Amino acid sequence: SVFSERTEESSAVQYFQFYGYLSQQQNMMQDYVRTGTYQRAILQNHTDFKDKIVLDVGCGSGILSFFAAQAGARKIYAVEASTMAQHAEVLVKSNNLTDRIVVIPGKVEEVSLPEQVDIIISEPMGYMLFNERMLESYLHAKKYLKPSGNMFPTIGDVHLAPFTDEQLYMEQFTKANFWYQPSFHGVDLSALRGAAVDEYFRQPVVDTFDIRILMAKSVKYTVNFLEAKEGDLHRIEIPFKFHMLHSGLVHGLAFWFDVAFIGSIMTVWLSTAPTEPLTHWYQVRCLFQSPLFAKAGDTLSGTCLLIANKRQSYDISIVAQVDQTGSKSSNLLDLKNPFFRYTGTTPSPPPGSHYTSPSEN
Amino acid sequence: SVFSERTEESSAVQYFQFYGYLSQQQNMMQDYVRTGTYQRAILQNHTDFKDKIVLDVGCGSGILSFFAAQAGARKIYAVEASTMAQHAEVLVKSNNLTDRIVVIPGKVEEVSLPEQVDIIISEPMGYMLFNERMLESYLHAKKYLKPSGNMFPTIGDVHLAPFTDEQLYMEQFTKANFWYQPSFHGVDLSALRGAAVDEYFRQPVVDTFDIRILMAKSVKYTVNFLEAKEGDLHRIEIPFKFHMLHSGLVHGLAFWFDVAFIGSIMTVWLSTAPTEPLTHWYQVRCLFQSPLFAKAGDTLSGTCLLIANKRQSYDISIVAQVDQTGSKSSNLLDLKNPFFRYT
Amino acid sequence: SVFSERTEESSAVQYFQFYGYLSQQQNMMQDYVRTGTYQRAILQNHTDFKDKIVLDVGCGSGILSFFAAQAGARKIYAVEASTMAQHAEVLVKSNNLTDRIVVIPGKVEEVSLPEQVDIIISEPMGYMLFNERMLESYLHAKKYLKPSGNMFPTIGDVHLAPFTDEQLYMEQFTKANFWYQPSFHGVDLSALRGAAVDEYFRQPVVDTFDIRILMAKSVKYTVNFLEAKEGDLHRIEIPFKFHMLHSGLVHGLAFWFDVAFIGSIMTVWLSTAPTEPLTHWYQVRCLFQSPLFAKAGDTLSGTCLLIANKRQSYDISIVAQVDQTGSKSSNLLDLKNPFFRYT
Amino acid sequence: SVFSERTEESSAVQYFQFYGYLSQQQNMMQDYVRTGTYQRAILQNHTDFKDKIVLDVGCGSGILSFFAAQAGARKIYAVEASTMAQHAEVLVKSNNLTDRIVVIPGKVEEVSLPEQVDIIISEPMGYMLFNERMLESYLHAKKYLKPSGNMFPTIGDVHLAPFTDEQLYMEQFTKANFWYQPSFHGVDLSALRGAAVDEYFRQPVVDTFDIRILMAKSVKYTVNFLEAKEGDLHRIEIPFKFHMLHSGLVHGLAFWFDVAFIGSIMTVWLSTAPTEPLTHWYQVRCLFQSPLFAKAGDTLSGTCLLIANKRQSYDISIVAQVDQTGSKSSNLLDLKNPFFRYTGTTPSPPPGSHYTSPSEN
Ligand SMILES: N=C(N)NCCN(CC[C@H](N)C(=O)O)C[C@H]1O[C@@H](n2cnc3c(N)ncnc32)[C@H](O)[C@@H]1O
Ligand SMILES: N=C(N)NCCN(CC[C@H](N)C(=O)O)C[C@H]1O[C@@H](n2cnc3c(N)ncnc32)[C@H](O)[C@@H]1O
Ligand SMILES: N=C(N)NCCN(CC[C@H](N)C(=O)O)C[C@H]1O[C@@H](n2cnc3c(N)ncnc32)[C@H](O)[C@@H]1O
Ligand SMILES: N=C(N)NCCN(CC[C@H](N)C(=O)O)C[C@H]1O[C@@H](n2cnc3c(N)ncnc32)[C@H](O)[C@@H]1O
């Protein structure tokens, strides 16, 4: 049982309890970009599925298996570890696809499949692509994949870029300064101010933002799921060298990801970039403990190291330095506990992004 | 050891992990009604604390212990199981109260105290008062209480009342109706709609509301913390008979609670009623899957039965009937997974 | 008789009893757009009537025959099957037009006319144009029309467009949810909810609406009354492909119609579109039991099939699909029993 | 069949098609006074039902049969001629009462019951009680009733009273005067004005009203369902002598009805009077073609004659005379085609009912 040795029990119980809820399945299914892009990818590459054997890793409601069924698959093994497996089976029954879709309750690391498959489908991406560590299960499932078999998605891209957001940065101190008062109902809280500040900065911020806060073209780190092994995802080192497009203070790094379905007919992309319509993954921003001043043309170099932990997530280590000035900043973050900041309000661009008089119009 | 026998470890880990965060302590402390009412209650009854030994069950940041210290307590044993305990001690030292406040890390069910105490203080109330099952720890702590000691709070009121809110009901039904689609991207989801309705309606709705949605005077169920035993909170049966003041559709039952600090000088009340300023407890509403029609003058009778579970919460069973017509409704709710509807 | 073979007696009796009431004639006549547009269409094309022989199919009060007489017709045969025929005759005499307007009581499928006519006039449009199946009588009357004769109206437009209206959908769903009750006075009705939802949603909604609910430019189905055969109206298949202009939930299809009077002098249009002044036809909406999500740029394709039945109406089957997602909806509507929602 | 002989096929078809709709059953079920009063009547007289054989004439959804089952009935024969019968059986099955309730599709005049019953229940009342002529089916069903069986309802009271309502009277001419114009789009409509007036006055008006429009205490006509024969309802002669309490113009007669359930434990009344909460029967008003002037103390004497027709309704002949003056009025009405006037607005009392200054207040 590969899964249990690399996963804390406490985390796994709640993790699979979470996905046992129909409401969450609904939440994901109602993400039109995600579901529509998967459906487009599967059906537009029907020759990759027609009369093929398919494996759906973590079928959830079973939706992707149904998409696979629409594409003409001869047999679909749909594996699911949460109680949702029982609901998926109901849908298979009610859609008269019992002869084509077989639901297998359990973890893909632990269940037995009767035969090799021609293609594996799954939706294992979390925040920052890697969150939840389901990608390792996705890669693990290749033990059931035939040589020259395919993976849907086939590759995953994670993007990095430095950003400026004075309000976001300042917000942390505004919140933490609650503890900087000598008589909260007669109690001096100040001694805990440092600890509070520390706690807030270790939280990655989940939300969206205006693309004009980005201070350099993103750096890309690619995982090829056809080529990658599980161990590749235990330690992910993403070095970066940003060529600053704008001068200003760098408050941290922004994160998003893309995945590609590379079929025989066409390649289909699913993107969570801030330039694209919002998805349920939104974007993730990691603050530096101290902002870095960089001029346009300067280089911001460093490393983002993602270290997997047993809470089905990652410890994020970011170190960055301005090569021209030696200005250096670092932060360590706990991705398992992100701060959901999104409010629905349209993000504002950084001031002043006006290069022409706003009053002439 | 108690607690471990009544609590699945997985739940407890996440539970005490949760309260180890300063941000949650801040969120609770910044609830001015709560903190201010507690401080007022403790300080105006200083004689119940003056030169006394105090036990603070779940001291968290330690705020209540500091209130106890301000009131003149001789010694306060502050028990906390989460890592917040490490932070509380820091505050005790920086406030020069080490001679009076003693932080004891661990679960109140497991720690050893040097002596019996004159009074127990705690803030163990959750959603619908009983959520989190900390009241059991609060009552459990009486093993350290002197035969004539006191408890702050002293008693707890849970109030029930039928309400009408078409908007909320259809709001939930609209969500459940997602699973009614016969062809969601070509897939028939309808077979699971019954399961979906059940899941959504099993969620208690946490928020506030205008009192004019209430269709009858509330029924009150009281827990006396001085008299109650831990075992009493494993199964809570609350019978009710409402005499309807208005005609209309009853979409469910609304819940809020009061606690009373009965001190030697005065009694101080903390209320989460919808007539009072909002607290972080808000109010809780349990929907019927189908509303019950009642005319003014009719009686709505039934029972709310709370069964404690191993996830530090309650399985809630509500059965309600219009006596004049036999119109009957039954519902099961999972308090551990509420729907936060507020703004 | 062609009429009796396609119509159950009960329906015909009720139908012609209905139009025997003066109050309905008043109701129709007081529709100023209708009456005025007919009169304008006839009078502006007076040369199509001047010294001509005219057939008025279903003359009712006789108003259109009077318009034809005003336009200078030599002789008008006014056919009416209801007892209104006796009232029309009273008006002909009191208006001193006995020499020009001849009322012939009976069904146009059954009466004998003394001669062939130069032009046929009628107002045979019902809800969604086709309701009441009077168009078939209108076309049947063409046996009396000269080879180079004309028809007023000459053509008919049926316009379809997808719409979004959460309020209407919830309004209809709320009614059907009555049957979701597990204990109505102690009785479980739920087993019938499916039958109830189906029944309510088979009702076309007759009323008006703001044009901003339309999510794509309309699709048109045209009937040319000069070219069409009666048999053409027994089965009407209307395929559609909508290019969505707005993203959102499609709750159903909106229907309205135009007719055109193509005369020698000018063409005059009568429209029941939602952009035009309201008529007694209002507009008609067919709800989906489950709405379809579509993005701007997507295509919504499908079919509206009308099958004539013996109750002087149509069984309507609407099937619609979002081509990009495979989301599919199907519905049956009984045009015979519409829901009059207008307030 | 006794039914077909007294009913034109067209009417019967339309009639039973109407009641095949769930929405129509729902409308009646949602009339709380009606349904609640029936349930109270049956349950509070449980000794009339416990271990008894029951006949439900025109069971519709079956609700009254269910009330009978709740009261402890041994066997319920539920007869229904519309397609609602198919739905009722579904409810009997889903409520696990197949052993106690037997749905019999068909007309009560045409079906066969296996045995005699102890009590007949029905809801056969129409506008002014007699509309729809369902009372005859109710009485017809007595062929299955034991010599000491009961009927629920047991009696029906029809109440008549003279009223004054100048606006209602004027409405008819306001509507009819549409036809009194010499050039409607160039056409003289005047010749049909008389016919239009006649048509409007032949319509009974269904709605409610303030009781102060009533000018005398009501006259009552009682039908005892235990004693009455079908033939008794073909011609109903209601003599009346009203002693006027108020002076004014009598514009017509107001009609409403009560039924009583006379059980072994108690008598329960269902009333549609204007002093009682509104039901879906509202009240019915029949206008005189010419109003009659009457003084307080005068007597208004005459006759209301109801003649049954084959459209499942009645032709109403009303003749009234002020005895002190000889002033006479008559009207003929078609109960089959009433005017539904109700609008939800609270009815106003006649002016001036203020005996003290409204400004005091
Ligand atoms: N954060 C996320 N992206 N979430 C995506 C939502 N689901 C995808 C559902 C489906 N593919 C759809 O698109 O509807 C993920 C589902 O996959 C299951 N799962 C995880 N590990 C597993 C494992 N070792 N073995 C079996 N199942 C596993 C989970 O229980 C969960 O139900
Ligand atoms: N629903 C609620 N509001 N709840 C109140 C929130 N806190 C109140 C903090 C403090 N009393 C104050 O008022 O600031 C409660 C704090 O007490 C701790 N606790 C719970 N069970 C315990 C147990 N068996 N043993 C020891 N500590 C326990 C929790 O870990 C938590 O940190
Ligand atoms: N929804 C609608 N408007 N609908 C149109 C409203 N009326 C038009 C009235 C007239 N043209 C006017 O403008 O006053 C329809 C009138 O025409 C008569 N009719 C129908 N079928 C017939 C038939 N087979 N044979 C003879 N007469 C028939 C009807 O009895 C009815 O009198
Ligand atoms: N204006 C009215 N209120 N009217 C009363 C409304 N319903 C009462 C239904 C039931 N008691 C309930 O409460 O749902 C009347 C129902 O009884 C049926 N019916 C009439 N004549 C019949 C006949 N000769 N044989 C069999 N059924 C008959 C009708 O088809 C209709 O379904």
Swiss-Prot record, chains A, D:
Mutant lacking the gene: phenotype: Neonatal lethality. The lungs of neonates do not inflate and they do not breathe. The same neonate lethality is observed with mutants that produce CARM1 protein without enzyme activity. Embryos are distinctly smaller at 18.5 dpc. They show reduced lipid accumulation in brown adipose tissue and reduced amounts of brown adipose tissue. Thymocyte differentiation is blocked at an early stage. Mutants display complete loss of protein methylation of the CARM1 substrates PABPC1 and EP300/P300.
Subunit structure: Homodimer. Interacts with NR1H4. Interacts with SNRPC. Interacts with the C-terminus of NCOA2/GRIP1, NCO3/ACTR and NCOA1/SRC1. Part of a complex consisting of CARM1, EP300/P300 and NCOA2/GRIP1. Interacts with FLII, TP53, myogenic factor MEF2, EP300/P300, TRIM24, CREBBP and CTNNB1. Interacts with RELA. Identified in a complex containing CARM1, TRIM24 and NCOA2/GRIP1. Interacts with NCOA3/SRC3. Interacts with SKP2. Interacts (via PH domain-like fold) with C9orf72. Interacts with PARP1; promoting PARP1 recruimtent to replication forks.
Chief localisation class: nucleus
Post-translational modification: Phosphorylation at Ser-82 is strongly increased during mitosis, and decreases rapidly to a very low, basal level after entry into the G1 phase of the cell cycle. Phosphorylation at Ser-82 interferes with S-adenosyl-L-methionine binding and strongly reduces methyltransferase activity. Phosphorylation at Ser-82 may promote cytosolic location. Methylation enhances transcription coactivator activity. Methylation is required for its role in the regulation of pre-mRNA alternative splicing.
GO molecular function ontology, one term from the record: histone H3R26 methyltransferase activity
Compartments where located: Nucleus; Cytoplasm; Chromosome
Keyword Cell division: no
GO BP term (any one): regulation of intracellular estrogen receptor signaling pathway
Effect on the protein upon substituting residue 34 to A: Loss of protein methyltransferase activity
Function comment: Methylates (mono- and asymmetric dimethylation) the guanidino nitrogens of arginyl residues in several proteins involved in DNA packaging, transcription regulation, pre-mRNA splicing, and mRNA stability. Recruited to promoters upon gene activation together with histone acetyltransferases from EP300/P300 and p160 families, methylates histone H3 at 'Arg-17' (H3R17me), forming mainly asymmetric dimethylarginine (H3R17me2a), leading to activation of transcription via chromatin remodeling.
EC numbers for this chain: 2.1.1.319
Keywords from the named record: Chromatin regulator, Chromosome, Cytoplasm, Isopeptide bond, Methylation, Methyltransferase, Nucleus, Phosphoprotein, S-adenosyl-L-methionine, Transcription, Transcription regulation, Transferase, Ubl conjugation
Top-level taxon: Eukaryota
Catalytic activity, reaction form: L-arginyl-[protein] + 2 S-adenosyl-L-methionine = N(omega),N(omega)-dimethyl-L-arginyl-[protein] + 2 S-adenosyl-L-homocysteine + 2 H(+)
Outcome after substituting residue 82 to C/T: Loss of S-adenosyl-L-methionine binding. Loss of protein methyltransferase activity
Residue sites binding S-adenosyl-L-methionine per the record: 25, 34, 58, 80, 109, 137
Site of covalent link Glycyl lysine isopeptide (Lys-Gly) (interchain with G-Cter in ubiquitin): 93
Stated regulation of activity: Methylation of H3R17 (H3R17me) by CARM1 is stimulated by preacetylation of H3 'Lys-18' (H3K18ac) H3 'Lys-23' (H3K23ac) by EP300 and blocked by citrullination of H3 'Arg-17' (H3R17ci) by PADI4.
Effect the entry attributes to changing residue 132 to Q: Abolishes histone methyltransferase activity and reduces coactivator activity
Tissue expression as described in the entry: Ubiquitously expressed. Within the brain, present in proliferating cells from lateral ventricular zone and dentate gyrus (at protein level).
Residue(s) carrying Phosphoserine: 82
Domain SAM-dependent MTase PRMT-type: residue ranges: 12-319
Name of the protein in its database record: Histone-arginine methyltransferase CARM1
